[PDB]
Amino acid sequence: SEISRQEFQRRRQALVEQMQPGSAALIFAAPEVTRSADSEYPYRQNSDFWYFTGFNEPEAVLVLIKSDDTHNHSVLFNRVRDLTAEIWFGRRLGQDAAPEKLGVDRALAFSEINQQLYQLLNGLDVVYHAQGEYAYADVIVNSALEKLRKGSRQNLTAPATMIDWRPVVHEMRLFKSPEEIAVLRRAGEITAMAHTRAMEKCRPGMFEYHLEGEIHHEFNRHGARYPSYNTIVGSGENGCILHYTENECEMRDGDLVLIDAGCEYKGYAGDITRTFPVNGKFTQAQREIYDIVLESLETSLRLYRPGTSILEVTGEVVRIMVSGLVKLGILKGDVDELIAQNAHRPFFMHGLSHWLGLDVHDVGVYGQDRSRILEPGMVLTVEPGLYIAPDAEVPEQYRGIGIRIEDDIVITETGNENLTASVVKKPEEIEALMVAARKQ
Amino acid sequence: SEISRQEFQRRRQALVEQMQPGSAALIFAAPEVTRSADSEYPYRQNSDFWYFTGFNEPEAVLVLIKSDDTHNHSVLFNRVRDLTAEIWFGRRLGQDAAPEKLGVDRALAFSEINQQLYQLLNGLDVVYHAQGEYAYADVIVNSALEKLRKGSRQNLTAPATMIDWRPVVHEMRLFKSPEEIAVLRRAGEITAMAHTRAMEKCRPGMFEYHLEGEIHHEFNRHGARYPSYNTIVGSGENGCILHYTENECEMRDGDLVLIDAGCEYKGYAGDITRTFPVNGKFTQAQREIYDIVLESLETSLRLYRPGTSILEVTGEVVRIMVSGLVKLGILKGDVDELIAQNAHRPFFMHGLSHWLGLDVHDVGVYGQDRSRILEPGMVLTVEPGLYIAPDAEVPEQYRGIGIRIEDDIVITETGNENLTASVVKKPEEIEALMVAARKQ
Amino acid sequence: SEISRQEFQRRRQALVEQMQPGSAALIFAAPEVTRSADSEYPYRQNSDFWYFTGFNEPEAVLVLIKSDDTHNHSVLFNRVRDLTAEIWFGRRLGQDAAPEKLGVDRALAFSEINQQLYQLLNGLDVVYHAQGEYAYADVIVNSALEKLRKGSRQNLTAPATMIDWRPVVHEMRLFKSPEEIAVLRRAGEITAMAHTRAMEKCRPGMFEYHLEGEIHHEFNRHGARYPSYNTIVGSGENGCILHYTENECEMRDGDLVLIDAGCEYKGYAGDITRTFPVNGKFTQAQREIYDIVLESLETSLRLYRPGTSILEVTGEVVRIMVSGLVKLGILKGDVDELIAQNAHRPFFMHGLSHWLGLDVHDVGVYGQDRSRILEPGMVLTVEPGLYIAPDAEVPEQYRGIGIRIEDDIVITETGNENLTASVVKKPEEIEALMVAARKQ
Amino acid sequence: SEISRQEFQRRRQALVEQMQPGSAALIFAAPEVTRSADSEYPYRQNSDFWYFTGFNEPEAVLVLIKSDDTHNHSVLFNRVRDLTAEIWFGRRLGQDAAPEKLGVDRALAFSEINQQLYQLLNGLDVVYHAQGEYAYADVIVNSALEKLRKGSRQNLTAPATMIDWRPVVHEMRLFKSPEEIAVLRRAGEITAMAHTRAMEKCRPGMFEYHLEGEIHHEFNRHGARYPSYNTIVGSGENGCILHYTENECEMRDGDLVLIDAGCEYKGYAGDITRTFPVNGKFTQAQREIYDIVLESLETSLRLYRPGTSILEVTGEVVRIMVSGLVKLGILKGDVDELIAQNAHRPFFMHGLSHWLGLDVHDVGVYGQDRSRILEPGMVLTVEPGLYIAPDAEVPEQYRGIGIRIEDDIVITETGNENLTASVVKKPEEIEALMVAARKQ
Numbered sequence A, B, C, D: 001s002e003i004s005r006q007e008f009q010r011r012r013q014a015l016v017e018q019m020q021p022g023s024a025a026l027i028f029a030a031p032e033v034t035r036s037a038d039s040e041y042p043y044r045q046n047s048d049f050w051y052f053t054g055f056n057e058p059e060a061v062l063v064l065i066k067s068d069d070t071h072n073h074s075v076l077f078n079r080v081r082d083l084t085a086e087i088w089f090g091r092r093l094g095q096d097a098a099p100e101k102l103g104v105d106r107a108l109a110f111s112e113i114n115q116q117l118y119q120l121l122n123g124l125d126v127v128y129h130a131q132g133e134y135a136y137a138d139v140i141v142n143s144a145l146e147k148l149r150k151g152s153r154q155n156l157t158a159p160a161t162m163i164d165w166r167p168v169v170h171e172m173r174l175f176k177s178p179e180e181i182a183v184l185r186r187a188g189e190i191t192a193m194a195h196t197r198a199m200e201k202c203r204p205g206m207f208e209y210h211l212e213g214e215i216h217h218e219f220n221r222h223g224a225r226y227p228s229y230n231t232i233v234g235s236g237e238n239g240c241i242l243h244y245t246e247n248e249c250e251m252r253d254g255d256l257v258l259i260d261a262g263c264e265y266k267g268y269a270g271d272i273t274r275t276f277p278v279n280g281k282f283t284q285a286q287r288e289i290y291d292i293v294l295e296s297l298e299t300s301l302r303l304y305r306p307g308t309s310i311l312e313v314t315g316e317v318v319r320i321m322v323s324g325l326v327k328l329g330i331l332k333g334d335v336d337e338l339i340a341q342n343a344h345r346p347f348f349m350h351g352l353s354h355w356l357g358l359d360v361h362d363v364g365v366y367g368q369d370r371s372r373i374l375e376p377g378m379v380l381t382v383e384p385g386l387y388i389a390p391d392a393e394v395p396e397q398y399r400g401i402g403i404r405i406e407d408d409i410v411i412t413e414t415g416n417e418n419l420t421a422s423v424v425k426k427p428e429e430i431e432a433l434m435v436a437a438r439k440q
């Protein structure tokens, strides 16, 4: 699955549709990012820039100019072609090929942006710019506007109104098209295959990072070169750290291992968590906590649909959690009082769900306490967890248990589609998978 | 292999030894680095900060204060412990454990650095600071010095002399200790095992990124989680791009594939290039170019020793290259004239060797044209290559061939030790390796 | 004459009237400005900040918040009272007295602006801010908006629309109220008295700066402590430099002296130029050039009225100039051709008129080539000049003559009122004034 | 009196003398400074830049390069000549005339400083730069050093040592040459004449600013166009504010007026305070406080000499003050206890003396509590004062009295020379001066 040329074109037109007439929108590319000295991290394009272009180079700027309700055009600034630079660091699109390749009307050299940008903004009323996103972008934009402000004698006028396009653009990104959903569907399968493989490879005495290695290899073999976030492999007490990425410990028989890992496929994030026994067999104490987290997830998967919210479903999860913890003697008291006191918070201290897309924690307005009414096309995670600290004042057997189980879903007309159910989460199915792998 | 507590202590003392009395050296940690939105790249500590500490957290500053030739102390600024932040993002050393853990005299909270740093610099004559390395560091240091400058009435005085410690520290890093050499020796083995595996896995119809996946998995399984640089897998014409990292093409029977890849093991870079046939059998035209690059490497490995230089060995390589290219009809004319005209430069447009250490292109002064006399303990690469452009005006059979063969060496008392010879480079040995793997 | 409390209130309401509902306007005070080391120049408030407040302190910010068409309020941030700081540097209004003194609803400490400003902007749709005016203001505003942008979990939202208020506010300042006109009327009288005195004091052998001293003393004695711009006293060839402020030369019998000087009275600029003979008697050559400049001025004073423009009146001046210069043999050819070739430009290289108000070169849109149709309440200068370079290829007697004659006017319903005609400009009246003074 | 070409040359050589070999010193000019919109304050050159050049333009940089103990040269960067810019804003030295005019070896265009400065610093070991003095200077210097640091392949090397020259240069400025002393002697006379005139002009019902006007006129008529600091005219309770510059009040019969005012003559500051009765006759209560301040001054003038300090003389002043205040019942108790408790500090809350030169509060190290041993050539003020607050709990008659009497002195071989004694300070002489003037 991929995003078509036509889709990128549709998105640009959808942005232009919302823009005032006599305006320009400026969308800047991500800078290259140093890892150490002269070596740089693998390039990751700005998600919003990528959303409108599918162009994976730095030093680029998309300019969408709306003259009126029927008349608009696009200008790309991008790196010029350079034989020496390209022999050394890799091929560049350049200006000639860009209009056709990316469906823009005009392409200019990024090295001329200071000489040309003010001319494109001259006489407009409004400029859409994400102020503070990148310092290099702010310098370029402020410099253009100052030229215009101070160029009265040259008959130049700056637009007096600057609008942040991020709210508009993030609202667009919040609702996935069919093409985006097909891509996220594949990201979900790829990620699921990685998680299955980790379960099948796990043995006592392997290190946490070994499962990371298996996962990343599986991502790569399906064409997802990079993870969407730094992989989490927390065995034992490390499972109680939500974004544990050290992955440095020997995995011990008797411990659980929590894997939070997701591929990046055509820019889109998969995001799965599976927790399972290092030795392939859950203990009673492990099952007792796992079953609460699993019921929370399964109930949420049943409930999520148009017209509810993350807040409303979270309320049900809290009830399931508080009830289960009371039955185990981890909480003491009346269930409804304990709920009213948020007595679950020492053990479940994060949200049930986040938006998912070009960013793993995706853009889009949640509303107060994530109360926004869900509609079809929204994509989100469902990730209940219980994390009992090594030093929690609870029965000894539950201490140092961290369990999270996470699926990715898209809201549909009648409910939701689960993108990540091809990896098992029922404990008996986990155990069968691991037994079968140990034979073979 | 690892770097000991004692070694980090020795390095600090070696820096202090060279410092003026009545001075302080400020070594700042790398910032965290955004990959996209709220997600960050895997943390990579500043190499120089790491060199003196082995401490892998951001928001940290090592302060070495020399009062006189016998009297000095160390202060660390680092992140305070925070239960919520650590539950979320991971464990922190904190102040209590730091003196013992890292062998410093005193540890303070980074959040108090603006309140405390000027007090440590008050009344000193000299401050060693790497100005321009990081903007956050410059703000902190300039702010401290301004307080002192303007604090005459509070009996404060700023040091008037600021010295860049990078030349001193990079000169130290240029000469590897026995411990560092043992670590780089292991990085070389790990990297070699990855390259062998790539050769054994390569088949026509696999993508360039699949060999990347195999390599990264092999790095990871030996405890080297990350590469030291972005892996290069250039098959066909992509082999003519020196830092080709797109790795996006289907590998075709008949093409060569050039793999430049290195692990990062305890901070230290492995760095190997092997070029080989995708189908396991070199053609005549491929052998003809390969043999020139291989003779260049083998001759350089024989020559490199104390008392020569990269420049001097490069001169021999150029002769080998120009002679081979004339025999193939790629160059025409007198060998010595062609050498004097640098007629090899369209086909070999980079240096034979770079320093290797905590950075893959390591710090340390090369001298003009890399003429510095080599001494024992210097670690460097040997990487001749020939890159014939798809459109070069040469016999058709050589067009679009990129070949590089690279080993990592340490200069010894009598010559050099090759750290990467455990992966094959003789063409018949490459072919036997790939045949054996294809059976199975 | 002064500006009333009620007037400042009317201006604020007039700004609020034009603002969108659910918006705030931020108007920042001028910074203190170093002259050398720890000494600062006399404080000059930002003209726009002054326009809305009449408040003459630094570290202050006026915030006008419009909730809707009937509901708005004002918040001032200003310096807190401080006995030690005030004993040392002077009295401060503080917070208690400010509401009553300046007619604002609320006053807060400037030292708390970062803790309070984001709370005032929370949930608004629009912020009016003069971006780039002052760096300290930009830091404060950007910092407030980032808090809001990133404060989703604390139920904070930034206004997405930022509008430059300078066009709106400068359009207001372009039209003077009756109160402003009475103040500028007094500034014109004060400035005129200074110019008369300079003419009466001038003798050969006095320095250019001596007339500056006389002028500044006269400004001061009527309560205008500072000039509105740096005083120009160009005798001889120095009269050909438009903003000659060195004022360092001995004034020589036989030379003319050009004085461009204006007081600052209650913030408003007077702006007069008178050129006259150092020895009290114009030569023939001096009269010949002077009469052209004087006819230009007198004709412009007759012409300026509602419905014409600076451009249209300039056209008449150019004709008068080109004709006069042709009669003297300074220009050669057909008058209408010479006009079409702008042949006057080597001798008259500036505009006839600029807006006048809180700035000597006042704010307000001119239109292309100063073609804006004049309306009642506009205040402007009328300043024709002829400047014949020492090395101009013209008859010897005209070389090194610089003459400018400038009056300040307000456009009325039927024409204009001259604010500066109480100082003489007819040459015979100049000569009589100087003769009478010499007796003284 | 003036500073000779030879003197500026001597100063430069004296700086070069102290510089390390293989070094360059960079001394930058002051920026132009906005007063409001497009109008700028009268230009004031950086004191240190002026000290070495006598050059009064912005956008200039003096570069002194020391190759070794006998070999050095000077390069000036300055504004290029421009007919249009000079016709508009005034004449420029340019490059051709600069070597001869300012005694430098070479002059280059400031517009080429980024292309040329790094070439001048290439291969040096040390750069002397006043870091943080001006932001534009820091940008230029850091930019030059980064080019060198990163220009290894172009055989460029940055100096690794940066030294602040301000301590060295301010130590030089602390000791005035005979030429400087003659200039300050004239500044003292000019300032004295202004103060005498203010006393002679003062009448009840005149405003504080009227005396300011008289003073500034007198400065100007002797060729000192500007004051060295903003003039202080505090009548009544305004005399209790140390840097009262509002000068806005009507001067009332019965009140004292305190005038702190100084000219700037050839860059050098005069600095005098005289306090006197508005009506020409001191009351008993006024005399009682005045006599304490006058004895303090007269005793200090007797005491100041080589080998004492400001601290040591201040101790005597404190004794005189505490004793006088006890006799008046303003302080109660034992004199020596009151001294030990610093009981004078509510009434005398500033230092007796500051260095005087190119800045009114001149550069140079004071030592702890101004304990530095005085040597010949040091120039300083002597300014005791007593300031009794309107609300001080003291006998009613002393409330709201501010008195300061200040002279400027140079330390000589045997004592001091008073530069400002040509204006009267004995009360009977003040009264006679004012009576004589009233007849006017």
Ligand SMILES: CC(C)C[C@H](N)C(=O)O
Binding pocket: A350, A351, A352, A353, A354, A355, A361
């Ligand atoms: C940043 C958030 C949108 C997601 C995060 N997992 C939370 O629940 O708090």
Ligand SMILES: CC(C)C[C@H](N)C(=O)O
Binding pocket: B350, B351, B352, B353, B354, B355, B361
């Ligand atoms: C940056 C250099 C030290 C290394 C690079 N491979 C070259 O030879 O040019």
Ligand SMILES: CC(C)C[C@H](N)C(=O)O
Binding pocket: C350, C351, C352, C353, C354, C355, C361
């Ligand atoms: C800056 C302008 C408004 C005024 C200037 N005197 C000119 O005519 O060019």
Ligand SMILES: CC(C)C[C@H](N)C(=O)O
Binding pocket: D350, D351, D352, D353, D354, D355, D361
């Ligand atoms: C700034 C100081 C050197 C001078 C000031 N008058 C004081 O005595 O405190």
Ligand SMILES: [Mg+2]
Binding pocket: A396, A397, A398, A399, A400
């Ligand atoms: Mg346990």
Ligand SMILES: [Mg+2]
Binding pocket: B396, B397, B398, B399, B400
């Ligand atoms: Mg071929």
Ligand SMILES: [Mg+2]
Binding pocket: C396, C397, C398, C399, C400
């Ligand atoms: Mg003449």
Ligand SMILES: [Mg+2]
Binding pocket: D396, D397, D398, D399, D400
């Ligand atoms: Mg009284």
Ligand SMILES: [Zn+2]
Binding pocket: A071, A072, A073
């Ligand atoms: Zn069009």
Ligand SMILES: [Zn+2]
Binding pocket: A243, A361
């Ligand atoms: Zn997360």
Ligand SMILES: [Zn+2]
Binding pocket: A260, A261, A271, A272, A273, A383, A406
């Ligand atoms: Zn997850």
Ligand SMILES: [Zn+2]
Binding pocket: A271, A354, A381, A383, A406
């Ligand atoms: Zn998630």
Ligand SMILES: [Zn+2]
Binding pocket: B071, B072, B073
């Ligand atoms: Zn010690």
Ligand SMILES: [Zn+2]
Binding pocket: B243, B361
């Ligand atoms: Zn490389």
Ligand SMILES: [Zn+2]
Binding pocket: B260, B261, B271, B272, B273, B383, B406
């Ligand atoms: Zn390599």
Ligand SMILES: [Zn+2]
Binding pocket: B271, B354, B381, B383, B406
């Ligand atoms: Zn290499």
